[PDB]
Design a protein around this ligand. Structure first.
Ligand SMILES: *[C@@H]1O[C@H](CO)[C@@H](O)[C@H](O)[C@H]1NC(C)=O
Ligand SMILES: *[C@@H]1O[C@H](CO)[C@@H](O)[C@H](O)[C@H]1NC(C)=O
Lengths: 385, 372
């Protein structure tokens, strides 16, 4: 449809799969980065390999994804526009946030690559495709890969490929790693951050650095679902963080069952949300998770790429090229830093007068979105900040 | 006449000043980033203030001086790419009570990332200090912390210049992890220090300057837009004479294509984590830029307020040099090299180094390594 709708539906499909396998843990991933890793594959994919991707990853009627347009890969700025526009906007140097994307296919050097796919994927994608010797020097190849990621991510994402996840037999490895740091519009003051208990369960607490401010924020109270949603804008008005906080320390299970694109949209509508002065408590958070994309996508219906049945004819003519490993790694730190702070006097008066709070001191969901398109950039479950 | 020559000459005039005040230390700074901060200032400076900068920095000379010569390279090096990363946090913070000329703001926005940011120094200088240090820290993925120390800002601060940069790049030719091991680095000929010494054999441009009693090695980064030059004196203690002599003219000579030749060579180079911060005020003042820091400043292109001056100017540079690269030697080739290659470049005592931009010949970073 549109990139907003497509990333969100994709996001909740992945979430359904991951919540299976990661109960009572933090979850954090970047749907947009995953989409762009797969777009790259999609480009050279054919037949059933291609149709599986399209159905799962929602590529269908996005602007810039048709086979007619794709055919023009080398020579047209329209190809994959809908996705490339967001990546381009978020990866550009700027003064209020930083994204680092390290996303690449590593292909065994013995397989011959179509000159006109290398060119295509280089035009549209950064990282693209890189040839490498798995056949005679896997642990070397693994070191190369790891050290490219660590370099492109400012040393943050280390040992993306674990030992003996490549070997002489590896054909092609997908690597997709992302770091984000942004400033709030309204900073929390460091002096206001305090140790407070985070209630993981009813019967269990862990002390965390809890940030605090009073400010004018958009909030919705969904009494029917027993929850509240807060929106915290990032500086320069192109992204925001939504935090979905169940009333009860263990209301998460329910929310996770019901949440979907339609529900998120309903809950965050103009209609429902209103700007109020509120006391905000939010943990400082350092989210980092790494997922095996093979297991995930394969439960979702993408199977051919990872096997003998792969048709990647648009990439190599070499019959046996498939995806051997596919990893996603996402890192974000959430802390005080922002552009503006309220005067003290103001806050003292506020303190006195404001009674409503949003106290995120128990598990919550969060989503970072691009405002304009409603694209989901990051989605997570915070159980242990 | 070009950004290459201006950047080089600027670089070595700074070096002449830092080398006095920073004896026996590591030195490391990014001349291009300093020049672009000064360009942001220059734009609103008038009169003597402006002239002082132009003399020292050698702007009038340059194509676009909008600022094409300088902007072209900044834009190229800051764009995302798959071989290197440069994070620039460069910004003027001006006390929020000073009205900023619309002309200026529009124009800095359009030429310079970061540009100019109003802030409250007058009644909340401690808070303002936190917000400034938090912005650098946020923008450098946590790498440069604490750019301003307690009491560097007060109710009398007008404008603070903040110019921070982080670099990380892949070599064309990777060193292997397994080849790095501790070797003695001769700080002096009485004092050794265990460092992680990287090792490889490969084909590199090298110049041996008998006259000068030094060798020059060039190590390309992947996709050859940038190289590091290592300038290694013969004698453990020959660094003093070299730093005495080096300047634009000399560097150009020593690295001409007459002079440099590609040989197969054993390279030993320390893993390096370079990070330094400088008070730009003391530097600049000694070079001849005094007005901008003073009562007499004329920055009337920025603001009408007459107390506008730069109160604090800090440069911070961080670069990690390690084994990471794009391509490694094959075992077969490695076998041959080991049998054939005898000559070495062993960077096991203090050396100068330069990272340059290949097409414009501009200096990106300049350093002295005494202590890896
Ligand atoms: C990824 O998951 C698949 C299971 O679908 C498994 O075959 C493969 O070993 C996994 N890779 C790693 C790194 O565990
Ligand atoms: C920087 O040096 C200037 C000029 O010598 C000095 O007045 C100022 O105190 C120094 N700044 C800091 C932060 O030390």
């Amino acid at each position: 449809g549109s990139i907003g709708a497509a990333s969100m539906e994709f996001c909740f499909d992945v979430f359904k799969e991951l919540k299976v396998h990661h109960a009572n843990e933090n979850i954090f991933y970047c749907p947009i980065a995953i989409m762009s890793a797969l777009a790259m594959v999609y480009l050279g994919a054919k037949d059933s390999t291609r149709t599986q991707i399209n159905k799962v990853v929602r590529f269908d009627k996005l602007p810039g994804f048709g086979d007619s347009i794709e055919a023009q890969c080398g020579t047209s700025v329209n190809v994959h526009s809908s996705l490339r526009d967001i990546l381009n906007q978020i990866t550009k140097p700027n003064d209020v946030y930083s994204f680092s994307l390290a996303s690449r296919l590593y292909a065994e050097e013995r397989y011959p690559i179509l000159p006109e796919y290398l060119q295509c994927v280089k035009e549209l994608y950064r990282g693209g495709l890189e040839p490498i010797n798995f056949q005679t020097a896997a642990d070397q190849a693994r070191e190369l890969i790891n050290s490219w990621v660590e370099s492109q991510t400012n040393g943050i994402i280390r040992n993306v490929l674990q030992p003996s996840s490549v070997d002489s037999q590896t054909a092609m490895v997908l690597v997709n790693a992302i770091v984000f740091k942004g400033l709030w519009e309204k900073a929390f003051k460091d002096e206001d951050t305090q140790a407070m208990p985070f209630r993981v369960t009813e019967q269990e607490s862990k002390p965390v650095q809890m940030m605090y401010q009073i400010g004018l924020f958009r909030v919705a109270s969904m009494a029917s679902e027993k929850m509240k949603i807060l929106e915290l804008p990032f500086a320069s008005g192109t992204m925001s963080m939504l935090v979905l906080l169940p009333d009860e320390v263990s209301g998460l299970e329910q929310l996770e069952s019901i949440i979907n694109f339609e529900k998120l949209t309903e809950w965050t509508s103009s209609n429902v949300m209103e700007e109020r002065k509120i006391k905000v408590y939010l943990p400082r958070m350092k989210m980092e998770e790494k997922y095996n994309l093979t297991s995930v996508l394969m439960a979702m219906g993408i199977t051919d790429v990872f096997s003998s049945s792969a048709n990647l004819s648009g990439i190599s003519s070499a019959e046996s090229l498939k995806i051997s490993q596919a990893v996603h790694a996402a890192h974000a730190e959430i802390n005080e830093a922002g552009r503006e702070v309220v005067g003290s006097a103001e806050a003292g008066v506020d303190a006195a007068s404001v009674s409503e709070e949003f106290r995120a001191d128990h598990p919550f969901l969060f989503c970072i979105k691009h405002i304009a398109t409603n694209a989901v950039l990051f989605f997570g479950r915070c159980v242990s900040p």
